[PDB]
Design a protein around this motif. Structure first.
Motif, mmCIF file in Angstrom:
data_model
loop_
_atom_site.group_PDB
_atom_site.id
_atom_site.type_symbol
_atom_site.label_atom_id
_atom_site.label_comp_id
_atom_site.label_asym_id
_atom_site.label_seq_id
_atom_site.Cartn_x
_atom_site.Cartn_y
_atom_site.Cartn_z
ATOM 1 N N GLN B 163 0.805 -1.201 0.000
ATOM 2 C CA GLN B 163 0.000 0.000 0.000
ATOM 3 C C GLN B 163 0.854 1.274 0.000
ATOM 4 O O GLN B 163 0.680 2.152 -0.843
ATOM 5 N N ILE B 198 -7.586 -4.865 -4.364
ATOM 6 C CA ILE B 198 -7.548 -3.546 -3.716
ATOM 7 C C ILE B 198 -7.549 -2.356 -4.670
ATOM 8 O O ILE B 198 -6.830 -2.343 -5.671
ATOM 9 N N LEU B 200 -7.137 1.878 -4.769
ATOM 10 C CA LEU B 200 -6.561 3.004 -4.033
ATOM 11 C C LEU B 200 -6.756 4.301 -4.811
ATOM 12 O O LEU B 200 -6.516 4.357 -6.032
ATOM 13 N N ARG B 218 -8.926 3.983 0.290
ATOM 14 C CA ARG B 218 -8.697 2.569 0.037
ATOM 15 C C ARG B 218 -10.029 1.806 0.075
ATOM 16 O O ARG B 218 -10.955 2.154 0.836
#
Ligand SMILES: Nc1ncnc2c1ncn2[C@@H]1O[C@H](COP(=O)(O)OP(=O)(O)OP(=O)(O)O)[C@@H](O)[C@H]1O
Ligand SMILES: Nc1ncnc2c1ncn2[C@@H]1O[C@H](COP(=O)(O)OP(=O)(O)OP(=O)(O)O)[C@@H](O)[C@H]1O
Ligand SMILES: COCc1c(COP(=O)(O)O)cnc(C)c1O
Ligand SMILES: COCc1c(COP(=O)(O)O)cnc(C)c1O
Ligand SMILES: [Mg+2]
Ligand SMILES: [Mg+2]
Ligand SMILES: [Mg+2]
Ligand SMILES: [Mg+2]
Ligand code: NA
Ligand code: NA
Lengths: 310, 310
Positions: B163, B198, B200, B218
């Motif tokens: 991340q 994921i 972002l 997120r």
């Protein structure tokens, strides 16, 4: 549970005509409409300028080849309109045909665009060598045609001076092939004024018992003082849509179609007047159909004009 | 009182990718979107077969001239996606530059399609000579970009393992120009379980007082066991729409975007399974987005995912 439509019409970047006037509305009504763009232009030809490319019969054939190889050549309806090339129109005939082999229940809705009338005299807007092809090849294959008065006359060979002559032409058109014939516009006399354009509908069908019957309708629409482009394509698209929902009720189908046009145009003319001033006649651009702003009317058009029975 | 969008992406007859995935949803949401079809194919390249023709850079320019000649070169947004030709993309950059000249407030939403990763290793699927053009000319012009993990990697030259490295790479892309960077999918680990991908988001903006503030978000999205096509184009189109309706709230824009893709995909996988049959893996044809049936979800998506502010 899905209705698949193959629409072969023009495409423009800016504006709503051809596949652009037909697609969004049918998508809003839930149809799985696949669009084949016979042309890609910057905007319709009523503008001072326009640039673009056209699709030729080979490329059209090529595109259809793709669908076939993938076994995706199964449609419920086929929709066609303005076609400028004879070889192209012929390729369309070969295509509808094969698609009808694949699906005998396929309904070919054909808008036989040939030209229109203005003030009094009418003239063609497409190559004259298209007229014989439409007569001998396209219409015999059609299930629903939507010509305007001028096109009804060219197709039948008879001039139309009154309602009874129109009905007679319609019967002639029925004999050529399509069970549904709708004259989308005409300068016929109207008890309401002369500021009105006339719509005539005629549908032949076999009832449950097996009796062959015909329903006829007439609508008198008040004229809007402006020239629109795309509305005939829209007309044919919605007719397809509404006959699909009300298959044995031509009256209701046409009333929903004609009312959808009314709301779209009412909104369109309001936005146009404001865009280019009081007293100023709106430009072709300002008269583009307010299609997306009319989503609700397309979904459930409030009936503002009922048809008279014939 | 229009918000015009110029979307330059591919067109398919059957299915939903490129302009097909982007137009309907944008139209449904009220935008005046004009579609330039960089190509016209029978179906996407994920099928066993596909035929069609491409639009060359001269033709793209030709069409643009039609718009300009009519003074129809005033857009609020420009949306671009998959392009295979370098010449075409260059022409696109020139078009956007001018459109920006015509309107300094225009927002260029760029989805720099370059490739993707299948379980671990990345792979490009467009000419390699496109990366420089994108890095040097394209991205610098863009106001909102939305690459998947792999494209962001290529664009920056920096590999993403977590991340915080993703946020560092996004900060690099901001410096390249765009104020909004959204990574639309990644391999990043989730505390939700392995079955999650994921997303972002990062938005560089100015607050009333006059200082530059950052918003980072997120989202952990549950993976669906199937390969969909057109979902990235849809993500980019919906991000445009919702960032427009919620200008200084990347959090909400993303929740509505991702939620929309969720409903569309849940409906798609369901119909796909119902056709393929229990146990059987749905084919590309069966996995084609149920776009039309998702109209209501597009209009007002029920938020099924909440974004976490970083
Ligand atoms: N000026 C107008 N005023 C009111 N209604 C109109 C006007 N123009 C078009 N319409 C609506 O659109 C419909 C179709 O008419 P148009 O003249 O647009 O198509 P056509 O010329 O009948 O069809 P085509 O040219 O595609 O074969 C009309 O029946 C009417 O419902
Ligand atoms: N298999 C899947 N399961 C769940 N969601 C998916 C799946 N595939 C795509 N999505 C949805 O589509 C969005 C974009 O992912 P996709 O992998 O479709 O685009 P990208 O590869 O991120 O973009 P692009 O390929 O255009 O550069 C994801 O954020 C998610 O919302
Ligand atoms: C002069 O033709 C305009 C036009 C129309 C008009 O339809 P209508 O609004 O007169 O019914 C349809 N398709 C194309 C490609 C067109 O170019
Ligand atoms: C592998 O790209 C498929 C595809 C996409 C996919 O977008 P996505 O669903 O992977 O986001 C878009 N346009 C064209 C022409 C495509 O062929
Ligand atoms: Mg007319
Ligand atoms: Mg027409
Ligand atoms: Mg992907
Ligand atoms: Mg894509
Ligand atoms: Na007509
Ligand atoms: Na992306």
């Amino acid at each position: 549970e899905e209705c698949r439509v193959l629409s072969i019409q023009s495409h423009v970047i800016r504006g709503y005509v051809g596949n652009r006037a037909a697609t969004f509305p049918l998508q809003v009504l839930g149809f799985e409409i696949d669009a084949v763009n016979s042309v890609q232009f910057s905007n319709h030809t009523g503008y001072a300028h326009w640039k673009g490319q056209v699709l030729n019969s080979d490329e059209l054939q090529e595109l259809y080849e793709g669908l076939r190889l993938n076994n995706m050549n199964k449609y419920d309806y086929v929709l066609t309109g303005y076609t400028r090339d004879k070889s192209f129109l012929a390729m369309v005939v070969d295509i509808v045909q094969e698609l009808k082999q694949q699906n005998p229940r396929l309904v070919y809705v054909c808008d036989p665009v040939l030209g229109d009338k203005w003030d009094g005299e009418g003239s063609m807007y497409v190559p004259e060598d298209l007229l014989p092809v439409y007569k001998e090849k396209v219409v015999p294959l059609a299930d629903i045609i939507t010509p305007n008065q001028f096109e009804a006359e060219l197709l039948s060979g008879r001039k139309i001076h009154s309602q009874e002559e129109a009905l007679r032409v319609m019967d002639m058109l029925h004999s050529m092939g399509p069970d549904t014939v709708v004259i989308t516009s005409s300068d016929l006399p109207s008890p309401q004024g002369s500021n009105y354009l006339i719509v005539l509908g005629s549908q032949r069908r076999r009832n449950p018992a097996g009796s062959v019957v015909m329903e006829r309708i007439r609508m008198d629409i008040r004229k809007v003082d402006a020239v629109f482009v795309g509305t005939g394509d829209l007309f044919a698209a919605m007719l397809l849509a509404w006959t699909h929902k009300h298959p044995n009720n031509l009256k209701v189908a046409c009333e929903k179609t004609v009312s959808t046009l009314h709301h779209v145009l009412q909104r369109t003319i309001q936005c146009a007047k404001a865009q280019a001033g009081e007293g100023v006649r709106p430009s072709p651009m300002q008269l583009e159909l307010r299609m997306v702003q009319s989503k609700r009317d397309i979904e459930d058009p409030e009936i503002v004009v009922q048809a008279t029975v014939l």
